[PDB]
Amino acid sequence: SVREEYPDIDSEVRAILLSHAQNGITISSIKSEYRKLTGNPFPLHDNVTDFLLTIPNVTAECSESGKRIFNLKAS
Amino acid sequence: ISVREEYPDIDSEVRAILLSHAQNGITISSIKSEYRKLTGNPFPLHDNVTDFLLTIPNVTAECSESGKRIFNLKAS
Asked: Does the CB of B40 have a partner CB in chain A at under 8 Å?
């Protein structure tokens, strides 16, 4: 239902991950980059982790500092 | 998650399961079944399991092309 309402959000989030595939990225930083990239506010306000984890090849992990870090799986 | 207060052993039990499956991956359903086999008790979390797992340091979750959410311990 997310991808049906915002058809481009999947490509936009993947674009952001692709540009940050070296060190990973938090949800707050993703929203930040999203605003710079599209000139629009991030359209998901809830269940963001679940959305990110429905994108193939995307990983999430609990960092040392406790922060939730997202990345692309190494190929 | 406030379940750690109510169940002080749950961190070590879940970590034990992950350690025993650190080779490949493990799904939430498989974790709950390993949990019952290990403790003789049902898994005390009924919701937000991904969030619980992702608050354990060194644990990862990934979207397999099979669609299943796979959890593992991060390498090295």
From this structure: no
CB environment B13-44: b (16+ within 10 A), e (fewer): bbeebbeebeeebbebeebeebbeeeeeeebe
How large is the C-alpha radius of gyration of chain B?
12
The total of other beta-carbon atoms located within 10 Å of residue B56's CB is 14
CA-wise closest residue to A53 among A38, A73, A67, A23 = A73
Whether B61 and chain A come into contact, CB under 8 Å, resolves to: yes
Take residue B54 and report the two structure tokens written for it.
Answer: 């992702």
User: Looking at beta carbons, which residues of chain B come within 8 Å of A53?
Assistant: 50, 61-63, 69
Q: How was this structure determined?
A: X-ray
Find chain B residues with C-beta within 8 A of A74's C-beta.
none
